[PDB]
Paper text:
Prion disease is caused by the misfolding of normal prion protein (PrPC) to its pathogenic isoform, termed PrPSc.
We also crystallized Nb484 alone and solved its structure to a high resolution (1.2 Å) by X-ray crystallography. Nb484 contains three complementarity determining regions (CDRs), each noncontiguous with the others (termed CDR1, CDR2, CDR3). These regions account for the specificity of the antibody for a particular antigenic determinant. Remarkably, the structure of the free Nb484 changes in the CDR3 from the same nanobody in complex with the MoPrP. More specifically, the orientation of the CDR3 changes upon binding with the MoPrP, thus interacting with β0-β1 loop and β2-α2 loop. The B-factors indicate that the CDR3 of the Nb484 is significantly more rigid in the MoPrP•Nb484 complex as compared to the nanobody alone. In addition, Arg106 stabilizes α2 of MoPrP by binding to Asn174, His177 and Asp178, while Ala107 stabilizes the β2-α2 loop of MoPrP by binding to Gln168 and Tyr169. It thus appears that Nb484 undergoes structural changes in the CDR3 to enable a greater complementarity between the nanobody and MoPrP.
Numbering used by the authors: 2 to 123
Write the structure that this text describes.
């Protein structure tokens, strides 16, 4: 296991949830880290990602202004703060990471994947 997700569960529409993703401190700040999500019968949609240093981040259009990705390199933990949650956001959320040489938007850059956490908006 390279990545361990926390957070998830049930949320009311308009509510908030924080996801987190931990990895080893040895190499933590060498990797971009992001979140993808998957609804049954569909593919893995990019949600957000953040560069190794935390200086750059990006988001899929439908979550801009609602979700914020951040990382605490000191604590070896990355976060997705999900605010104003909507039915469209129900999915399994996967933490992913890839070497910092990749641009964060490159799907092909994500080497490691967590097991996923289910988020259901009531």
């Amino acid at each position: 296991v390279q990545l361990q997700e926390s957070g998830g569960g049930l949320v009311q529409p308009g509510g908030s949830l924080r996801l987190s993703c931990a990895a080893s401190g040895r190499t933590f700040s060498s990797y971009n880290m992001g979140w993808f999500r998957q609804a049954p019968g569909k593919g893995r949609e990019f949600v957000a990602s953040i560069t190794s240093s935390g200086d750059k981040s990006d988001y899929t259009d439908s979550v801009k202004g609602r979700f914020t990705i951040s990382r605490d390199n000191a604590k070896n933990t990355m976060y997705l703060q999900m605010n104003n949650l909507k039915p469209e956001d129900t999915a399994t959320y996967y933490c992913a990471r890839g070497l910092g040489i990749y641009i964060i938007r490159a799907r092909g850059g994500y080497d490691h994947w967590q097991q996923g956490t289910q988020v259901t908006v009531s």
